[PDB]
């Protein structure tokens, strides 16, 4: 077919964005500590009818 | 500082030897080397220090007991005869002086090719 060389069009016309400086991510036991403390200690004031885990 | 004790004890009067398991206790510094444990066991056995051998030392993961096998003999001639040459090599009684690979096998090959007077000439020289 004549339009076979339409390759890399999106990665050639997509503007690049510099990945900004993100802090280090605590892993393992610390990650499970923050996953427990994100959704098991101070969420129950917000009642379980509505849910807001990401927006 | 250190404390050397025995755990299991056997006696073989056929070879004039006494075998034991040695635990050295450490609430302090590192594993005591070959010389000082041998000297303290020779002092506790109250004989000449050139007769008692010991081999193997463990460590129970931070201080504690170190475990080894000790051979207390009574005769130095029986020590030179009964102990193997690798345990004579700790004090340097036996030396082989050519600890090289393929020497024996290449002498076997050079004695396998030729035979007789030429074999005694090449294989020895």
């Amino acid at each position: 077919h004549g339009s076979l060389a339409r390759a890399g069009k999106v990665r050639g016309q997509t503007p690049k964005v510099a990945k900004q400086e993100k802090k280090k991510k605590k892993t393992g036991r610390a990650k499970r500590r923050m996953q427990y403390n994100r959704r098991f200690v101070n969420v129950v004031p917000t009642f379980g009818k509505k849910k807001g885990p990401n927006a | 500082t250190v404390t050397i004790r025995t755990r299991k004890f056997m006696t073989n009067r056929l070879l004039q030897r006494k075998q034991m398991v040695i635990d050295v206790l450490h609430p302090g510094k590192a594993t005591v080397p070959k010389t000082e444990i041998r000297e303290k066991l020779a002092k506790m056995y109250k004989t000449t220090p050139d007769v008692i051998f010991v081999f193997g030392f463990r460590t129970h993961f931070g201080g504690g007991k170190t475990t080894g096998f000790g051979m207390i003999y009574d005769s130095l001639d029986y020590a030179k005869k009964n102990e193997p040459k690798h345990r004579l090599a700790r004090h340097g009684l036996y030396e082989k002086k050519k600890t090289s690979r393929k020497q024996r096998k290449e002498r076997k090959n050079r004695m396998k090719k030729v035979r007789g007077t030429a074999k005694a000439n090449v294989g020895a020289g």
Binding site: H1, L4, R6, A7, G8, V10, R11 | -
Partner: protein, 141 residues
């Protein structure tokens, strides 16, 4: 309707051994045509060298031009229409390059968008396509 006597186990094993062939999976697993018909010789991966680069059309509800690599094998020697997975990589796959191929999700069927391609490009001359689609491990020049 069955046969349920104490001396009927020969009749049972004969009947189940006859009716077991009518399943598709048993006959494609224990008939030699799944060795002497397919490529790979019954394998998972095979190297191959590019013969041509052909764009195929997609199905009827999806209007797309998929990119395919006609692969000449090394082991069997069959001609295989492969598929370039990602967005670029048509510029990264040149003419007559060593290409490792695999399946999509199933040996029998193909992907519901591509009509007649069972195979998918993995490597480009001993350096994989995921690295070339990312920034590291660029091809030899």
């Amino acid at each position: 309707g069955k046969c349920r006597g104490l001396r009927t186990a020969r009749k049972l094993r004969s009947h189940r051994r006859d009716q077991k062939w009518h399943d598709k999976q048993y006959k494609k697993a224990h008939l030699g045509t799944a060795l002497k018909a397919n490529p790979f010789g019954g394998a998972s991966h095979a190297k191959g060298i590019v013969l041509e680069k052909v764009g195929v059309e997609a199905k009827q509800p999806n209007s797309a031009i998929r990119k395919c690599v006609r692969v000449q094998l090394i082991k069997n020697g069959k001609k295989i229409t492969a598929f370039v997975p990602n967005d670029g990589c048509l510029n990264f796959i040149e003419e007559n390059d060593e290409v490792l191929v695999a399946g999509f999700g199933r040996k029998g069927h193909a992907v519901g968008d591509i009509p007649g391609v069972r195979f998918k490009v993995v490597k480009v001359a001993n350096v994989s396509l995921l690295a070339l689609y990312k920034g590291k491990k660029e091809r030899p020049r």
